[PDB]
């Protein structure tokens, strides 16, 4: 696993083309996230 940029704790991937996309984020230490919900689902076939 790499290091975060000197002076920073994470990276924010800001979308700069797809206007409908929300952000993505990267952490470099596994201790910076906690799994709160497990969601079981099917994708639904559009009608």
């Amino acid at each position: 696993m790499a290091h975060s940029p000197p002076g920073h704790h994470s990276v924010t991937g800001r979308p700069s083309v797809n206007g409908l996309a929300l952000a993505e984020y990267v952490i470099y230490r596994g201790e910076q996230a906690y799994p709160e919900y497990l969601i079981t689902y099917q994708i639904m076939r559009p009608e």
């Binding site: 696993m1 790499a2 975060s4 940029p5 002076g7 920073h8 704790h9 994470s10 990276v11 924010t12 991937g13 800001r14 979308p15 700069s16 083309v17 797809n18 409908l20 996309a21 929300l22 952000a23 993505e24 984020y25 990267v26 952490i27 470099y28 230490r29 596994g30 201790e31 910076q32 996230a33 906690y34 799994p35 709160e36 919900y37 497990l38 969601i39 079981t40 689902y41 099917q42 994708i43 639904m44 076939r45 559009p46």
Partner: protein, 161 residues
């Protein structure tokens, strides 16, 4: 140390998590190649993940970050999709869950869009789809995502497409 508690569909928490799931579906630029073609989900079950040790590991790091950043953790609720969600809920995130080839370097990736994490459920790029039918767009087989609490601290802003 992990237990899973089923939420009732009548519970406001089931309803707010279902809503974040359903409301952050977007179309993807791969036309559904990686994750399938759908506009909404059939939510079959929502379970709360409880593990004391993993929680304390999270809050410890959260405080260190906060104190390096004028008392601001910059905490978010974000999706994560993977074939290893059953390992993550038991052992936590670590370098085995890192996307070595990701755009922002070797780290662990999270999404605001549920449908972005859905693309990683059967592997990078959707792998070979469901185990039973080998279908990345399977409408029969049951899938699983994590909705996670994440500490960003001082985040390096990378503009990108």
């Amino acid at each position: 140390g992990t237990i899973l508690i089923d939420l009732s569909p009548d519970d406001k928490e089931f309803q707010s998590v279902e809503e974040e799931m359903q409301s952050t579906v977007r179309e993807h630029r791969d036309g559904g190649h990686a994750g399938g073609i759908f506009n909404r989900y059939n939510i079959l079950k929502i379970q709360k993940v409880c593990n004391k040790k993993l929680w304390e590991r999270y809050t410890h790091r959260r405080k260190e970050v906060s104190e390096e950043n004028h008392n601001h953790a910059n905490e978010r609720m974000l999706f994560h999709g993977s074939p290893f969600v059953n390992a993550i809920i038991h052992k936590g995130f670590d370098e085995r869950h890192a996307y070595i080839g990701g755009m922002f370097g070797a780290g662990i990736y999270f999404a605001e869009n549920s449908s972005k994490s859905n693309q990683y459920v059967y592997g990078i790029g959707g792998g070979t789809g469901c185990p039973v039918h080998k279908d990345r767009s399977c409408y029969i087989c049951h899938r699983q995502l994590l909705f996670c609490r994440v500490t960003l601290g001082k985040s390096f802003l990378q503009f990108s497409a």
